[PDB]
Amino acid sequence: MELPRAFGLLLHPTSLPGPYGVGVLGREARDFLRFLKEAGGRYWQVLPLGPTGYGDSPYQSFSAFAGNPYLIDLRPLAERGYVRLEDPGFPQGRVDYGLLYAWKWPALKEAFRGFKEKASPEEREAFAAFREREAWWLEDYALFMALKGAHGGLPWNRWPLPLRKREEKALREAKSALAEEVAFHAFTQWLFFRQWGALKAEAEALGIRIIGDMPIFVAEDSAEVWAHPEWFHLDEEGRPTVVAGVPPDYFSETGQRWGNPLYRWDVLEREGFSFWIRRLEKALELFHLVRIAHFRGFEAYWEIPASCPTAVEGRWVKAPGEKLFQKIQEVFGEVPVLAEDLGVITPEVEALRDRFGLPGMKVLQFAFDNGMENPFLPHNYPAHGRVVVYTGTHNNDTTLGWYRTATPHEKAFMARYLADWGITFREEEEVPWALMHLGMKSVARLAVYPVQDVLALGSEARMNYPGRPSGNWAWRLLPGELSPEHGARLRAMAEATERL
Numbered sequence: 491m492e493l494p495r496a497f498g499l500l501l502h503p504t505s506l507p508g509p510y511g512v513g514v515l516g517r518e519a520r521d522f523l524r525f526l527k528e529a530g531g532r533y534w535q536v537l538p539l540g541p542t543g544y545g546d547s548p549y550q551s552f553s554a555f556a557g558n559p560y561l562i563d564l565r566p567l568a569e570r571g572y573v574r575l576e577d578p579g580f581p582q583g584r585v586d587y588g589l590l591y592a593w594k595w596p597a598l599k600e601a602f603r604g605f606k607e608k609a610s611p612e613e614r615e616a617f618a619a620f621r622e623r624e625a626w627w628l629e630d631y632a633l634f635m636a637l638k639g640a641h642g643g644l645p646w647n648r649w650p651l652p653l654r655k656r657e658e659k660a661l662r663e664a665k666s667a668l669a670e671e672v673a674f675h676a677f678t679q680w681l682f683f684r685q686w687g688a689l690k691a692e693a694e695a696l697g698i699r700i701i702g703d704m705p706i707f708v709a710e711d712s713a714e715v716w717a718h719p720e721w722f723h724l725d726e727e728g729r730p731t732v733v734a735g736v737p738p739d740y741f742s743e744t745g746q747r748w749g750n751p752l753y754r755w756d757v758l759e760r761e762g763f764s765f766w767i768r769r770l771e772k773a774l775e776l777f778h779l780v781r782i783a784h785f786r787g788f789e790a791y792w793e794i795p796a797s798c799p800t801a802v803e804g805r806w807v808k809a810p811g812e813k814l815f816q817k818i819q820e821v822f823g824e825v826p827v828l829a830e831d832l833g834v835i836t837p838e839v840e841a842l843r844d845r846f847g848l849p850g851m852k853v854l855q856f857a858f859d860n861g862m863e864n865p866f867l868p869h870n871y872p873a874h875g876r877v878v879v880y881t882g883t884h885n886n887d888t889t890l891g892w893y894r895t896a897t898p899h900e901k902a903f904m905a906r907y908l909a910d911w912g913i914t915f916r917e918e919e920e921v922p923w924a925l926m927h928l929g930m931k932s933v934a935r936l937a938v939y940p941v942q943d944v945l946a947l948g949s950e951a952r953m954n955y956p957g958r959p960s961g962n963w964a965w966r967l968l969p970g971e972l973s974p975e976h977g978a979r980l981r982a983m984a985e986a987t988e989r990l
């Protein structure tokens with residue numbers, strides 16, 4: 491791919507400011523792209539954009555192809571008379587996902603009813619054309635969501651067996667009984683992809699590329715697992731026999747049990763990796779580069795027996811990553827993938843990554859807890875520069891929050907290392923920009939920073955706190971918080987480090 495030397499910002503669209511309780515694909519998104527352009531930035535990174543469930547995590551989606559209806563801007567629909575909007579009592583600066591679930595779904599339904607009453611034949615034609623182009627995944631997704639609502643939110647593998655096991659007559663009759671709910675969910679997808687497409691075109695007109703994200707493993711309760719059980723290790727009741735995770739390995743004593751279903755890679759290979767080709771094909775309609783979380787799972791993955799409550803009694807299983815990425819290269823003529831390669835990886839994983847020229851990642855918040863041999867320190871970055879450096883990711887605290895809770899060793903070593911690189915600070919509030927400066931001085935081709943660190947916000951603005959049940963994925967910008975002065979300061983730092 492060869493990345494230019496540049497910088498960008500990490501901002502999930504839910505974090506955009508604006509009315510009605512959540513960031514959406516509208517005027518404030520265009521304002522952020524203009525801000526990014528004026529700052530000299532060339533990349534916008536987001537988290538996965540699929541529909542979310544309990545816990546609101548982007549990394550556990552009801553579909554590997556669908557888009558998130560919570561990101562739909564309702565204002566264009568109200569300006570055309572499809573729906574009336576009135577704020578039920580949302581906070582600003584934070585998504586209330588409980589209130590969003592209770593209020594925004596009814597609002598979208600009214601817009602759909604109003605749409606069918608006044609859409610105009612021309613808008614009805616775009617909708618009809620969308621349903622026919624996307625039918626190969628949309629039929630299953632729309633009926634999945636329709637059945638989900640009709641069964642009170644139960645997962646698919648708890649529905650009545652004729653529906654759980656996708657009997658022809660059962661599905662045909664359900665599709666007829668739920669015809670209007672199916673059409674409604676198709677309507678939400680049409681709106682999402684229409685609005686995202688306009689935003690992608692605006693990004694391209696401003697010289698900006700979008701980095702998306704997808705988890706290597708899909709979610710248990712999802713349309714593609716229900717419709718394609720043969721791709722996964724499931725029993726007859728539709729429940730996983732083994733689950734994803736990682737072993738203890740001298741950083742944890744218990745490892746991690748994620749619970750995701752695991753691919754039958756022999757089946758995927760016999761099918762020419764069809765699922766993965768289509769998954770990446772759809773992703774590249776939205777993004778220019780695609781990050782894949784837990785990239786190492788393409789070389790080998792930790793298999794946990796489903797009945798086990800921890801990850802200690804698993805085993806490593808090789809996956810055909812080499813064959814998969816040869817196929818991707820053949821189909822697409824290039825591999826537009828970014829490897830999430832944090833945590834200890836093996837030579838086999840590095841060789842897979844580097845054979846196809848894929849950039850890896852560096853996270854500066856992990857660089858100071860040892861040493862000078864720590865690979866996240868910039869003098870250790872590869873001379874070819876094919877890495878993306880972050881201060882922190884969505885899973886980390888903000889950099890001010892991290893500094894406030896860091897160990898004495900970390901804080902002292904960070905200050906000395908920065909000083910060795912000509913960067914000093916007097917107050918804690920200056921640490922986020924100090925570390926952003928260090929990343930920009932490095933040989934990493936791309937430096938990408940969370941917007942919370944541009945604003946030097948504390949832990950109250952942390953996007954996700956792994957292991958914490960509630961309060962995640964909810965931080966939002968306030969109107970005007972990201973100012974032209976922030977942008978000019980970024981541009982000056984980019985000029986100084988040869989990133990414009």
Ligand SMILES: OC[C@H]1O[C@H](O[C@H]2[C@H](O)[C@@H](O)[C@@H](O[C@H]3[C@H](O)[C@@H](O)[C@@H](O[C@H]4[C@H](O)[C@@H](O)[C@@H](O[C@H]5[C@H](O)[C@@H](O)[C@@H](O[C@H]6[C@H](O)[C@@H](O)[C@@H](O[C@H]7[C@H](O)[C@@H](O)[C@@H](O[C@H]8[C@H](O)[C@@H](O)[C@@H](O[C@H]9[C@H](O)[C@@H](O)[C@@H](O[C@H]%10[C@H](O)[C@@H](O)[C@@H](O[C@H]%11[C@H](O)[C@@H](O)[C@@H](O[C@H]%12[C@H](O)[C@@H](O)[C@@H](O[C@H]%13[C@H](O)[C@@H](O)[C@@H](O[C@H]%14[C@H](O)[C@@H](O)[C@@H](O[C@H]%15[C@H](O)[C@@H](O)[C@@H](O[C@H]%16[C@H](O)[C@@H](O)[C@@H](O[C@H]%17[C@H](O)[C@@H](O)CO[C@@H]%17CO)O[C@@H]%16CO)O[C@@H]%15CO)O[C@@H]%14CO)O[C@@H]%13CO)O[C@@H]%12CO)O[C@@H]%11CO)O[C@@H]%10CO)O[C@@H]9CO)O[C@@H]8CO)O[C@@H]7CO)O[C@@H]6CO)O[C@@H]5CO)O[C@@H]4CO)O[C@@H]3CO)O[C@@H]2CO)[C@H](O)[C@@H](O)[C@@H]1O
Pocket residue numbers: 542543544545546547548549550587588589591642643644645705711736741742746748749783784785830832833834856857859860861863864865885954955956957958959960961
């Ligand atoms: O008391 C009691 C109580 O109880 C209760 O109550 C309660 C409850 O319960 C609760 O819940 C609560 O509630 C609440 C809540 O919370 C809230 O929220 C609210 O709610 C709400 C909601 O939310 C909303 O939503 C709504 O709801 C609604 C909905 O919407 C709808 O939909 C519906 O629902 C429905 C649905 O639909 C359905 O489905 C159903 O559901 C159901 C179901 O079915 C069931 O099942 C259940 O669920 C469940 C599920 O299923 C399951 O699955 C689960 O899930 C979950 C889970 O569990 C969890 O966990 C979570 O998850 C998540 C997480 O968290 C997050 O975080 C995420 O994650 C992710 C991420 O993000 C991403 O990023 C990724 O990550 C990953 C990655 O990628 C990978 O790769 C990995 O990584 C890793 C690695 O691997 C490893 O390795 C590591 O690494 C690391 C390491 O360790 C470290 O160490 C470091 O290292 C480093 C260092 O540092 C440095 O230094 C370096 O080193 C180096 C050095 O330097 C040098 O020096 C060297 O060294 C050396 C030396 O030198 C010598 O001397 C020695 O040696 C040495 C060595 O060599 O070198 C070195 C090396 O180089 O470097 C290094 C390296 O690097 O670092 C590293 C790195 O990092 O680690 C890592 C990291 O970690 O991994 C990762 C991970 O981990 O991915 C991930 C994933 O995978 O995400 C996730 C997900 O996605 O969550 C989940 C979920 O989401 O579970 C669950 C449960 O839970 O159930 C359900 C239900 O429930 O059905 C339903 C029905 O409903 O509807 C609804 C309604 O109704 O709304 C709501 C409201 O309204 O609220 C609530 C309340 O209100 O709470 C409560 C209370 O309050 C009862 O109730 C009562 O009563 C009682 O009382």
